[PDB]
Design a protein around this ligand. Structure first.
Ligand SMILES: [Mg+2]
Length: 179
C-alpha cells in the first residue's frame, strides 16, 4: 500500500506571485490531508532547470509541508517539461533520495502552460502520471490536448484542466480511493 508521490510543479515566468503561492498551498494541502499515511512525498520545481525542493528522506524526517517548502524560490523562466519529467524519473525516484522500492510511483505534474522543450518521456511511462493544467493558457481544447502526452491513460482520468485549484475533486481523497 506504499505510495511514493512526486509533485513536479511549474515555476515559469507566467505565474503571478499569488498563482505560484497557490501552487505551493495546493501541494501543502494534499500532504496535510494525506499525512501519517503510507504516502511519502517529494517535490521538484521546474522552469528552465529542475530543483528537488525536498526529497522523500526530508519528508520522513520533518513531516511538515510548511517547513519542507519554506525555502522555495520561484524560478521565473521557461517550462521544460520533457527535461523535468525525465529528471524525476531518473534522479528523484531513487533509493538514494529515500524512495522505497516496494512503493507505487505517482507523479503529479502542475503546470500553467505548454512545454517549451521537446523529446520524449519514455523513462517515466510506467509511473502513474496526473497532469493539472491551470489557468488561461489552457482555454482552448487544442492547448489542453498538448498535455495528454505527459499523463497516464486515459486522459479523461489523468488530465485535469482547472480554472482554480478549488474546483479540483479533492486529490488526496481521489488518490487514496484509486491508487
Ligand atoms: Mg507558464
Amino acid at each position: 500500500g506504499n505510495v511514493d508521490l512526486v509533485f513536479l510543479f511549474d515555476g515559469s515566468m507566467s505565474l503571478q506571485p499569488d498563482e505560484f503561492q497557490k501552487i505551493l498551498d495546493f501541494m501543502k494541502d494534499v500532504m496535510k490531508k494525506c499525512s501519517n499515511t503510507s504516502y511519502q512525498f517529494a517535490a521538484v520545481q521546474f522552469s528552465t532547470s529542475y530543483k528537488t525542493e525536498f526529497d522523500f528522506s526530508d519528508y520522513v524526517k520533518r513531516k511538515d509541508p510548511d517547513a519542507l517548502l519554506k525555502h522555495v524560490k520561484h524560478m521565473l523562466l521557461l517550462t521544460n517539461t520533457f527535461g523535468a519529467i525525465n529528471y524525476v524519473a531518473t534522479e528523484v525516484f531513487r533509493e538514494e533520495l529515500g524512495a522505497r522500492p516496494d512503493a507505487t510511483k505517482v507523479l503529479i505534474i502542475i503546470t500553467d502552460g505548454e512545454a517549451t522543450d521537446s523529446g520524449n518521456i519514455d523513462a517515466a511511462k510506467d509511473i502513474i502520471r496526473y497532469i493539472i493544467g491551470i489557468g488561461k493558457h489552457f482555454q482552448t481544447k487544442e492547448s489542453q490536448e498538448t498535455l495528454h502526452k505527459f499523463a497516464s491513460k486515459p486522459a479523461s482520468e489523468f488530465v485535469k484542466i482547472l480554472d482554480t485549484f478549488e474546483k479540483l475533486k479533492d486529490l488526496c481523497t481521489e488518490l487514496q480511493k484509486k491508487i
